[PDB]
């Protein structure tokens, strides 16, 4: 009856055949590929219009990049 | 009827001593009118509560603990 | 490092002087790897160094894959003979 | 505990087994009393012989009975199991399962009704309830 | 109708878990001296609680907010002596 | 440094500091009051903390023994700020750190007490709480109204004091 | 003749919804749950008794 | 020490009695779904039924078949029960309210869980029957197959939290239970938990096999008790995994306003009340999941071995790998990687 | 050479219904040869009937397919009626048709629900056995027995 | 191999006397006493012979009597080669 | 001696106590017929190990690589923020590589037990 019509013969007919006759594989594949494609195509849009990326959190004591000043107070 | 309200109503109609007696013999709580008594001392009851299913409207309470 | 070293040496001797069955050889391989990982993890703790623990993790993953392949090889060997001799190799 | 956890292995030979099925059906609902039927004799306390026992079947029945862990009891259900019934004069029929296994209770009928079988189970429970176990050891 | 006898065992299970958890909460608070438990504590929190023990006299999780430490705080410092990991 | 392993014993040293080293007070607050005061300590003592850390870096291995005088300054500044808090804002400070003691030391569980503490410390000590590193677009979380994350039980005394301050007009 | 996939009235997304969300299994579970709120059939032998007729043997 | 002992006794009694009453609840619930009553006679309202079964079995003779490794057959059910009960040490009934407050609690759950296949594996070897070996092999294959599914869902959840502390995972769900954004994962986790406990409709081994009743066919007495207890204990424990991973554990609703009305300061009364509310929330979720196990038993016929292996490896696992891809992608797109 | 593995499916087995000894030969998963051994319920009924009068032999037919008692009775009655060259009256014919279809319902309840129980659908059995109880009351009210009615007879 | 231990009569008698305290039957102190007695047949007593009976032999009967407790190449390999061991 | 260690010791003790009670209270009367394996009431002959299908081997063997794949993601989920975008790309590449292997397994039909016997579909032809 229904049988694999070959992806390379016609792309959209094969995709329709898969969605009708192999839903588990077809939608597993759709969900799997949605992610990376969405990342590449949508993260810059989110940055431009929704909100920019957040400022980084400190990971250690933030050491000044300078020489030691002379200071005064709380002395012995 | 498996409802809690049926059990509460029958226990109220029947009284606590009868409630405990029934709970210790038959395990349900029935309320119905006495029809008569055995030569052996068993007592027989008929109920007309609409919450009682077909074949449950007649019942016996036995005279002795080792009922048979 | 004592426990790892003893485990490795005794497992190696069990592998070598095994004259009983082939499963003992598989087990001795697995436990030699365990002993090596124990030695490594103790040194990793004493240096407070992540490199030893990283290597130990990799060792665990490779031991899993090696077990899978070794047992596949054993099953393929069984397929033609139907039995494993106490020299089955 | 013996009365409340009453687990029979079914030797469901013949038409009597149908009545046994009706004991577990909603009207009588045997499991309301704690009765559960077990495939394995290892997990069973009661054997219920429900049907005609043929000569070809007799060693099989003895074997299933012997694999029951103790304590164990046997209920004979129906005329066939009780004494041979309608097939008593047959060349291929054991004349009562008590030629093969000891029997604790005999339930009459062809078949016994569901209520008759329940009555027999109650008789076995009465026998259980009157057993001396530690009192018997104390007598020794 | 709602079959209440079929709900009785579920009620027993629900009541047992509920009462056991309430009793456990009370026992934990009592073990803590009147405050809730600490959870998900890292190495920083562990060191802070040890320092707290040095400041409050070994009174568990008791807190003191006085600016200046007592004299004993200078000399009750602990180092740990760990056995050789052979 | 790693935590201790299989078998260890704690041991105390009974010696005194060498007499050449000038003596110093030690901070007497425990973890909850210190966490409550941490931002004010940072605000006031940033130059001394930075100098202490810079000394330690420049000593290149001998930092403990070479920065003792810088460390003395750091500890004196911390003691001074905690003393000021104990003199001017003790009730609100105690509200805040007792709330912290009930909420696993999570600042998100104590915003009402913290609001009073911040107002008191700003009005009587001129110290301000501020989170470094945010852009003007980014909003500091402690200033956020209607946060996603809320405590299981808003602290009783803190709720009452917050409502009272809102009546009085202080907050 | 049996119909092929391409001559189906339902689109593939509706069929996939039925397939992944177990529609008929959920209908079956609901039918079972409806029974849970109905009167049971059990009688309490030997305090109650099943029907008996004058012809009974 | 004393408080520790009291707390352990309370927790252990509650767990063991909950397991005992789950069997009664299954019998009653199946019964009413089948228009019958179930145990209503052993004890009042049939409330002593489980204890009658337990005493009966404790007085039943142990049989050791002739070709049997008797030690292995008596210790296999013992170890399955021991691991099954050890799993309870990390379940919290409120924030930090647990016997073991482990920063590696999720890892503990997974490791003790992976010790759960050895009962089926060793029970078949207990005898010298080829029927037994084949049945044990199939049951073991099903168990590890659905272990993969459960582990995958665990990892997917940890992607949102970045913590192995069970209390922390529960605490992050005060914003939303994880079953709301990941509802298909709720369905999949329940399906896999039923399969992992070898419950209907995933009960090949016991109900379509060469041996009449699974690999427990040869067990009588206390070993049978061990297997039965371990099974029901694992039902409740895997439901607790479901509860804390996806159902918000001990969280119900914000009772801050109500508590501020009721109480004016901290007391043992307010602490007891908060503990009761938290534990009751977790308990009611456990009750719904246990009811669902029984309901699914009531509604469906069994799979075959081939059907279930296909379901795990050809339908569920590819979806879970696709989800492995899509969850970090969504976190990246919106800049929502969780901190530690 | 393929070596079969041989299993006794039954008799003491839930699916084998207590009396079937199905000796199966499997190569791994698949059945290659099957050998049903029967006679575990061979009662010698056909030998017994030869020593009975026709009326005395009628109840043996109840006990052949012992969920379909009245149709078993019906086939024996129709055979004997054909040999006797007599005609059942009209009301009798209608009662036999009505109770034949009641018997068909009883049989199909047993068979479909037992089939479902074997695959693992446990609930249809309970639901259908209540209907069986209702119909067996009709059996008992016309014949005085729940199962072995001996109700349909030659004539 | 059946395990045999030899013990001093005093020690073993003490043990059997101690074990008589449990409720199930257990080796008697008097059975230990009898362990030092060998069978003594009356010179003047009727035997199996007077009943026209011939006792069976323990060695011939032991395997039958003890069957349930029993513990349990070159051509086999060559023969095994012809069979199938793994399938689809 | 916290609650964790005490609970873990206590569980096996209770198991052993129940076992001991059963040994102490139940009767013990082995005999030959009772000691037989239960196989539907009959006895079967001892047989050479059954020939098994390769899918039985393959499920268990393939469990280990897939299990290791899944468990290798634990360091990622415990470090996701720290490695954020670089590690996100790396973990995607790792997952895609493993998915290629899943594809191989699916397309080779590696876990399917094929029913060896199939209905005959040949036409019937007669040489007239
Ligand atoms: C997710 C994350 C995204 C990254 C991964 C992307 C994967 C997406 C793949 C989409 C597949 C969808 C699909 O339906 O495929 C049907 C297919 C089944 O088809 P089928 O007809 O039913 O198979 C049975 C037939 O009998 C079998 O018939 P068959 O024997 O003819 O096989 C059909 C074919 C079916 O496979 C496919 O049709 C899908 C292949 C799509 C990917 C091809 C990429 C090629 C890009 C380069 C362009 C080359 C031409 C450029 C021309 C010059 C331009 C002027 O199978 C293959 O040949 C597999 C392809 C093997 C790799 C060959 C590609 C070479 C690598 C190219 C590298 C490009 C480098 C770029 C340089 C950098 C530039 C920035 O399913 C799969 O492919 C399974 C998934 C595996 C995908 C790999
Ligand atoms: C939640 C389950 C109930 C949902 C559906 C309720 C249906 C119903 O009440 O009418 C029965 C009705 C039977 O008609 P009827 O027998 O002629 O008249 C009913 C009686 O007159 C009246 O019968 P009734 O007296 O049973 O109904 C009044 C009932 C409530 O009346 C209501 O319907 C109020 C609205 C629903 C709230 C349910 C409150 C009680 C929830 C049970 C847990 C108690 C705590 O109040 C009670 O008596 C509660 C039972 C007494 C306490 C039970 C013992 C507690 C033990 C511990 C349990 C803890 C674990 C849980 O059946 C239906 O109408 C169709 C029911 C099909 C339900 C479809 C599924 C519903 C959604 C899924 C629920 C999943 C479970
Ligand atoms: C709770 C504590 C444990 C309770 C155990 C009770 C008991 O011993 O029952 C024995 C009892 C003996 O079995 P049996 O059928 O009589 O076989 C013995 C022969 O038939 C013939 O029997 P036999 O003459 O060879 O005697 C064997 C003897 C063992 O006797 C000896 O071999 C010792 C000989 C040395 C004597 C001198 C020693 C120095 C004494 C110093 C003076 C004092 O055992 C006894 O005499 C009875 C046990 C002693 C209890 C007496 C208590 C009296 C005061 C109350 O065991 C059973 O009933 C079988 C139940 C099935 C057990 C299945 C599970 C076994 C595997 C468990 C492995 C657990 C691994 C966990 C890690
Ligand atoms: C309230 C009760 C608690 C509720 C439930 C727990 C169980 C309660 C039931 C308590 C007792 C009833 C069960 C007692 C019972 O059947 O053993 C009876 C004897 O009978 C007594 O006379 C032997 C004396 C029995 C000792 C009774 C101890 C009661 C507390 C147990 C802890 C049968 O063993 P038995 O004679 O073959 O004697 C032994 C025994 O079974 C094995 O330990 C031996 O190793 C073996 O050689 C065998 O010969
Ligand atoms: C993604 C990773 C997670 C899933 C990984 C599993 C991949 C499995 C795919 C596969 O195995 O292909 C085989 C199958 C061929 O069909 P079949 O006849 O059953 O082959 C069996 C061999 N005897 O292949 C199939 O028939 C089904 C697979 C079809 C793949 C096409 C799906 C295209 C997805 C289209 C929707 C995309 C979503 C929106 C994208 C927007 C940007 C484009
Ligand atoms: C040992 C067998 C394998 C060990 C399993 C490891 C389980 C584990 O993760 O233990 C962690 C736990 C302490 O870990 P942690 O979460 O950091 O505690 C901080 C609580 N605020 O550990 C504990 O809480 C208690 C210690 C459990 C292990 C002790 C076993 C002793 C091993 C020595 C055996 C002697 C021979
Ligand atoms: C099968 C079992 C499925 C049962 C699932 C029931 C889900 C309902 C509870 C969802 C809980 C959750 O994760 O978020 C609830 C949370 C409660 O809000 P609140 O108490 O005021 O605390 C505010 C601090 N966030 O915040 C919310 O109120 C958000 C709204 C509730 C979550 C969406 C509910 C609508 C969809 C329900 C579908 C559930 C599955 C079907
Ligand atoms: C926690 C509770 C632990 C209770 C365990 C106590 C075991 C006592 C049972 C016993 O006496 O040994 C039984 C064991 C059975 O094996 P066996 O009789 O040799 O062969 C039967 C094959 N049909 O016989 C044996 O071979 C003994 C095996 C274990 C050796 C323990 C010796 C116990 C001596 C009792 C004094
Ligand atoms: C949670 C526990 C709730 C259940 C307890 C009530 C059952 C009951 O007490 O029932 C009464 C029991 C005996 O039960 P019965 O002989 O079956 O009579 C029931 C009458 N029937 C047959 C008509 C139904 O009396 C007792 O010895 C109670 C002592 C049991 C203590 C163990 C409790 C375990 C905890
Ligand atoms: S006694 Fe009657 S009903 Fe029972 S099996 Fe025999 S013939 Fe059938």
Tab-separated table of C-alpha atoms in Angstrom, chain I residues 68-135:
chain	number	residue	atom	x	y	z
I	68	UNK	CA	-23.000	-23.255	26.000
I	69	UNK	CA	-25.179	-25.860	27.727
I	70	UNK	CA	-28.535	-25.220	26.071
I	71	UNK	CA	-27.189	-25.234	22.500
I	72	UNK	CA	-25.459	-28.566	23.214
I	73	UNK	CA	-28.819	-29.854	24.446
I	74	UNK	CA	-30.396	-28.402	21.315
I	75	UNK	CA	-28.164	-30.281	18.893
I	76	UNK	CA	-28.786	-33.600	20.637
I	77	UNK	CA	-32.525	-32.887	20.795
I	78	UNK	CA	-32.708	-32.000	17.093
I	79	UNK	CA	-30.862	-35.188	16.124
I	80	UNK	CA	-33.158	-37.376	18.229
I	81	UNK	CA	-36.230	-35.499	16.957
I	82	UNK	CA	-35.166	-36.121	13.368
I	83	UNK	CA	-34.783	-39.837	14.083
I	84	UNK	CA	-38.139	-39.874	15.930
I	85	UNK	CA	-39.942	-38.024	13.106
I	86	UNK	CA	-41.784	-35.722	15.533
I	87	UNK	CA	-42.380	-31.969	15.493
I	88	UNK	CA	-41.641	-29.541	18.330
I	89	UNK	CA	-44.622	-27.187	18.863
I	90	UNK	CA	-44.299	-23.534	17.962
I	91	UNK	CA	-43.923	-22.066	21.463
I	92	UNK	CA	-41.255	-24.661	22.211
I	93	UNK	CA	-39.392	-23.668	19.048
I	94	UNK	CA	-39.500	-20.007	20.082
I	95	UNK	CA	-38.263	-20.807	23.594
I	96	UNK	CA	-35.409	-22.814	22.089
I	97	UNK	CA	-34.444	-19.959	19.756
I	98	UNK	CA	-34.652	-17.341	22.537
I	99	UNK	CA	-32.598	-19.409	24.954
I	100	UNK	CA	-30.185	-20.345	22.186
I	101	UNK	CA	-29.439	-16.667	21.740
I	102	UNK	CA	-29.230	-16.107	25.506
I	103	UNK	CA	-26.759	-19.011	25.518
I	104	UNK	CA	-24.817	-17.403	22.664
I	105	UNK	CA	-24.541	-14.185	24.694
I	106	UNK	CA	-23.318	-16.152	27.725
I	107	UNK	CA	-20.738	-17.982	25.619
I	108	UNK	CA	-19.435	-14.844	23.938
I	109	UNK	CA	-19.170	-13.040	27.269
I	110	UNK	CA	-17.009	-15.900	28.521
I	111	UNK	CA	-14.910	-16.167	25.361
I	112	UNK	CA	-14.277	-12.480	24.624
I	113	UNK	CA	-13.624	-11.602	28.264
I	114	UNK	CA	-11.337	-14.622	28.766
I	115	UNK	CA	-9.469	-13.692	25.568
I	116	UNK	CA	-9.038	-10.124	26.832
I	117	UNK	CA	-7.925	-11.449	30.218
I	118	UNK	CA	-5.273	-13.603	28.543
I	119	UNK	CA	-3.839	-10.636	26.644
I	120	UNK	CA	-3.912	-8.653	29.908
I	121	UNK	CA	-7.127	-6.563	29.793
I	122	UNK	CA	-8.425	-7.646	33.186
I	123	UNK	CA	-11.500	-5.389	33.563
I	124	UNK	CA	-13.841	-6.573	30.751
I	125	UNK	CA	-13.943	-9.932	32.545
I	126	UNK	CA	-15.518	-8.423	35.674
I	127	UNK	CA	-17.943	-6.255	33.711
I	128	UNK	CA	-19.059	-9.180	31.545
I	129	UNK	CA	-19.401	-11.645	34.385
I	130	UNK	CA	-22.011	-9.426	35.976
I	131	UNK	CA	-24.063	-9.716	32.769
I	132	UNK	CA	-23.486	-13.474	32.890
I	133	UNK	CA	-24.901	-13.462	36.431
I	134	UNK	CA	-28.053	-11.718	35.213
I	135	UNK	CA	-28.567	-14.247	32.401
